[PDB]
Design an enzyme around this catalytic site. Structure first.
Site, PDB file in Angstrom:
ATOM      1  N   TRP A   1      -5.315  -7.498   3.997  1.00  0.00           N
ATOM      2  CA  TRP A   1      -4.626  -8.630   3.395  1.00  0.00           C
ATOM      3  C   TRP A   1      -4.183  -9.634   4.446  1.00  0.00           C
ATOM      4  O   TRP A   1      -4.264  -9.365   5.647  1.00  0.00           O
ATOM      5  CB  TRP A   1      -3.401  -8.134   2.628  1.00  0.00           C
ATOM      6  CG  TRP A   1      -2.348  -7.488   3.493  1.00  0.00           C
ATOM      7  CD1 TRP A   1      -1.330  -8.116   4.159  1.00  0.00           C
ATOM      8  CD2 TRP A   1      -2.213  -6.091   3.783  1.00  0.00           C
ATOM      9  NE1 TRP A   1      -0.572  -7.196   4.843  1.00  0.00           N
ATOM     10  CE2 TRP A   1      -1.092  -5.945   4.632  1.00  0.00           C
ATOM     11  CE3 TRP A   1      -2.931  -4.947   3.405  1.00  0.00           C
ATOM     12  CZ2 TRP A   1      -0.671  -4.698   5.113  1.00  0.00           C
ATOM     13  CZ3 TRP A   1      -2.509  -3.703   3.882  1.00  0.00           C
ATOM     14  CH2 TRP A   1      -1.389  -3.593   4.727  1.00  0.00           C
TER      15      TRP A   1
ATOM     16  N   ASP B   1      -8.668  -2.042   2.920  1.00  0.00           N
ATOM     17  CA  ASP B   1      -7.413  -2.360   2.240  1.00  0.00           C
ATOM     18  C   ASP B   1      -6.782  -3.382   3.180  1.00  0.00           C
ATOM     19  O   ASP B   1      -5.833  -3.079   3.907  1.00  0.00           O
ATOM     20  CB  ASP B   1      -6.500  -1.138   2.123  1.00  0.00           C
ATOM     21  CG  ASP B   1      -5.186  -1.456   1.413  1.00  0.00           C
ATOM     22  OD1 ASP B   1      -4.271  -0.607   1.427  1.00  0.00           O
ATOM     23  OD2 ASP B   1      -5.074  -2.554   0.834  1.00  0.00           O
TER      24      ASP B   1
ATOM     25  N   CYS C   1      -7.331  -0.741   7.258  1.00  0.00           N
ATOM     26  CA  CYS C   1      -6.210  -1.336   6.533  1.00  0.00           C
ATOM     27  C   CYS C   1      -5.359  -2.222   7.436  1.00  0.00           C
ATOM     28  O   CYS C   1      -5.131  -1.897   8.605  1.00  0.00           O
ATOM     29  CB  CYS C   1      -5.352  -0.216   5.940  1.00  0.00           C
ATOM     30  SG  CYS C   1      -3.848  -0.758   5.097  1.00  0.00           S
TER      31      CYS C   1
ATOM     32  N   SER D   1       0.855  -1.173   0.000  1.00  0.00           N
ATOM     33  CA  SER D   1       0.000   0.000   0.000  1.00  0.00           C
ATOM     34  C   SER D   1       0.894   1.226   0.000  1.00  0.00           C
ATOM     35  O   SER D   1       1.664   1.436   0.934  1.00  0.00           O
ATOM     36  CB  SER D   1      -0.897  -0.023   1.236  1.00  0.00           C
ATOM     37  OG  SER D   1      -1.619  -1.242   1.291  1.00  0.00           O
TER      38      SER D   1
END
Ligand SMILES: Cc1cc2nc3c(=O)[nH]c(=O)nc-3n(C[C@H](O)[C@H](O)[C@H](O)COP(=O)(O)OP(=O)(O)OC[C@H]3O[C@@H](n4cnc5c(N)ncnc54)[C@H](O)[C@@H]3O)c2cc1C
Ligand SMILES: NC(=O)c1ccc[n+]([C@@H]2O[C@H](COP(=O)([O-])OP(=O)(O)OC[C@H]3O[C@@H](n4cnc5c(N)ncnc54)[C@H](OP(=O)(O)O)[C@@H]3O)[C@@H](O)[C@H]2O)c1
Ligand SMILES: Cc1cc2nc3c(=O)[nH]c(=O)nc-3n(C[C@H](O)[C@H](O)[C@H](O)COP(=O)(O)O)c2cc1C
Ligand SMILES: [Ca+2]
Length: 604
Positions: free
Chosen positions: A603, A601, A556, A389
């Site tokens: 992961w 965002d 995120c 990112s």
């Protein structure tokens, strides 16, 4: 040829398997299914939908026993992969009668995301709405569990369904490529790690993208934390003169190189001269996939830049390797791992997956296994780019892309030390010249259109990455004399004196007035865990006022646990202060997502 149906007729195929893939997993699954056809007296081909026109599906009935399968991955917000976008757009606008078309869909997804397998679900749903006949149930592959096992289980049932419906029956390892050693080639005609066009890394010409990455110089690479325990770093990549554009929220993708030491060990245990330059050529002369990676190239180069030698191998690799193990016990162990259940499956999940054994580890723990290096190069998957990112604002750093990353390094149950490919490679880049092959991938993660709109950012650990850029931008806006709404950051680390990222930068932004609030949760400074959601709950009154007023929420970082816990906390804030039922608060938060006011965002 533009019509895949005509291509099928011309090449004698009755099964076509389309893949919607970004990092190659769906493509591999499609290739594996295509190859399976032969075992049933059928013939298949895999195909990239973008190279064709799916409107031609209505012509499939012209081929006897025609069957079409779709292996589709889902990406950002339940959208299709880039190569499947045209197909997706066609499916939404068409109303063509697909009566006579017989299909099956295997979706690749991950349950930690909001729209789990949305693409596979949509394709499967739409084809039926259009009149096509489903041959076997939709496969819901989940990469959060074990995608491979989901695939081989579905694949087994799929072929049984194909045999029953089409009246066919099942009938030695077949190479897809043949080796050619280039003993007299010009040094300049050999690929040395570049992607796509030969010499594209040396002769850099725009536009730069996935097929033509821009080699950015590493101007900065600094350690962000204290302990020698873990390594967290901040890098700045010079994109001057690349014409590349980006916005805070976008991702930067990089193409790494495997550890030289690991490659050398592979070469030695395989008893192969890695400096030999060769080419692997597709035995199917009509395929557009002439080589498995850029050729000609040396084995060293292939193992370093083109092949994945660190990920625990999928079952087909282990099954194919079994033929090269001379020790009976060893050969049986490898072959058994392709089983969809029983001891074979348990062994695969434990010996390969849980133990995180990479190819060298497998060759070391099965010493009688001595496969030819060229076949191994055909079996290993392609080395993929890694995404980060972007941690900078293009308003402040238009000619640089910043990365905030944590180095991956851990000990396995098999007694080895595994090192993450991209992070250790990035860590070794010395600041100015060290070059990093990269490109920018646009996302929907963006600051509000109106500067006055408040933002609530939640990003513990490296999840703080995009927010460093967000804050830079909001600060820039204030310096332009614009009215900017509240900017709140909820960050977290284990200990304030060990892994507190950008401590000084964030403190200064707060003193400047750009960062309205800096709320940090130190998880390991007490007996019990203190996380960002705990701070969000404590701040429920102010957060609800901001949310009600139109503020944008951004989350995120860790997708498996943090994202879910944070989302649940927001449900509670809305339910408690919005004076509505929990289920209504859930609908409320999900609606914010559709309005672009709750962005993720995350992961694994
Ligand atoms: C959209 C997106 C944005 C991202 N942004 C960032 C970012 O800003 N910063 C950042 O640092 N990362 C980010 N990532 C993660 C990043 O892309 C890489 O996956 C990560 O840096 C690791 O890559 P690697 O090549 O070093 O590790 P790899 O060689 O790919 O190895 C990673 C794998 O190692 C295993 N692993 C790691 N630790 C352990 C352990 N203790 N035990 C067992 N197995 C373990 C897991 O199976 C893990 O999947 C992002 C990912 C996505 C998809
Ligand atoms: O990047 P990185 O991997 O290096 O980050 P990381 O250190 O693994 O984690 C970042 C922060 O997130 C915390 N955390 C862990 N599980 C969480 C959850 N379910 N919800 C909210 N916060 C959580 C961590 O605390 P702990 O590691 O102490 O659980 C840590 O303080
Ligand atoms: C940026 C990104 C976004 C993703 N978004 C989703 C999603 O919304 N839903 C889902 O089920 N899986 C999602 N996934 C998981 C992938 O669909 C899964 O990893 C798949 O195996 C990838 O296939 P590929 O290698 O063929 O591209 C996402 C993965 C990435 C890297
Ligand atoms: Ca506070």
């Amino acid at each position: 040829e533009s019509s895949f149906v005509e291509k099928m007729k011309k090449t004698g195929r009755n099964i076509i398997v389309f893949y919607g893939s970004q990092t190659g997993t769906a493509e591999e699954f499609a290739n594996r299914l295509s190859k399976d056809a032969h075992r049933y007296g059928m013939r298949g081909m895999s195909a990239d939908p973008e190279e064709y026109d799916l409107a031609d599906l209505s012509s499939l009935p012209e081929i006897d026993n025609a069957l079409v399968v779709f292996c589709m991955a889902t990406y950002g917000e339940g959208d299709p992969t880039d190569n499947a976008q045209d197909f997706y757009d066609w499916l939404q606008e068409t109303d063509v009668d697909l009566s006579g078309v017989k299909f099956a869909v295997f979706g690749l997804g991950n349950k930690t995301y909001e729209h789990f397998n949305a693409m596979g679900k949509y394709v499967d749903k739409r084809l039926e709405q259009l009149g096509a006949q489903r041959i076997f149930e939709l496969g819901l592959g989940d990469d959060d569990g074990n995608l491979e096992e989901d695939f081989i289980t579905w694949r087994e049932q799929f072929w049984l369904a194909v045999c029953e419906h089409f009246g066919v029956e099942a009938t030695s390892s077949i190479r897809q490529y043949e080796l050619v050693v280039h003993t007299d080639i010009d040094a300049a005609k050999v690929y040395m790690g570049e992607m796509g066009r030969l010499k594209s890394y040396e002769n850099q010409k725009p536009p730069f993208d996935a097929k033509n990455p821009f080699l950015a110089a590493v101007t900065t690479n600094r350690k962000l934390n204290q302990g020698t325990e873990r390594h967290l770093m901040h890098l700045e990549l010079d994109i001057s003169d690349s014409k590349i554009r980006y916005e805070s929220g976008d991702h930067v993708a990089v193409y790494p190189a495997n550890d030289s030491a690991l490659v050398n060990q592979l070469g030695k245990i395989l008893g192969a001269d890695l400096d030999v330059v060769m080419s692997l050529n597709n035995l199917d002369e009509e395929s557009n996939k002439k080589h498995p990676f850029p050729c000609p190239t040396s084995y060293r180069t292939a193992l370093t830049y083109y092949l994945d030698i660190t990920n625990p191998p999928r079952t087909n690799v282990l099954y194919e390797l079994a033929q090269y193990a001379s020790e009976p016990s060893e050969q049986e162990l490898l072959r058994k791992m392709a089983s969809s259940s029983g001891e074979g499956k348990e062994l695969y999940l434990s010996w390969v997956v849980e133990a995180r054994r990479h190819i060298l580890a497998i060759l070391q723990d099965c010493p009688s296994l001595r496969p030819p290096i060229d076949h191994l190069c055909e079996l290993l998957p392609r080395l993929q780019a890694r995404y980060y990112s972007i941690a900078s604002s293009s308003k402040v750093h238009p000619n640089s892309v910043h990365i905030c990353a944590v180095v991956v390094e851990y000990e396995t149950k098999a007694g080895r030390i595994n090192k993450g490919v991209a992070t250790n490679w990035l860590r070794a880049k010395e600041p100015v010249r060290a070059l990093v092959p990269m490109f920018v991938r646009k996302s929907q993660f963006r600051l509000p259109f109106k500067a006055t709109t408040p933002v609530i950012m939640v990003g513990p650990g490296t999840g703080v990455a995009p927010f460093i850029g967000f804050i830079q931008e909001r600060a820039w806006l204030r310096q332009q004399g614009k009215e900017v709404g509240e900017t709140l950051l909820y960050y977290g680390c284990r200990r304030s004196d060990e892994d507190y990222l950008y401590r000084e930068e964030l403190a200064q932004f707060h003193r400047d007035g750009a960062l309205t609030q800096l709320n940090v949760a130190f998880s390991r400074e007490q007996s019990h865990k203190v996380y960002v959601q705990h701070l969000l709950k404590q701040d429920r009154e102010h957060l609800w006022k901001l949310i009600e007023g139109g503020a944008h929420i951004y989350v995120c970082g860790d997708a498996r646990n943090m994202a879910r816990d944070v989302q649940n906390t927001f449900y509670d804030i809305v339910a408690e202060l919005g004076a509505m039922e929990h289920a209504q608060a859930v609908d409320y938060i999900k609606k914010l997502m559709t309005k672009g006011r709750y962005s993720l965002d995350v992961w694994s």
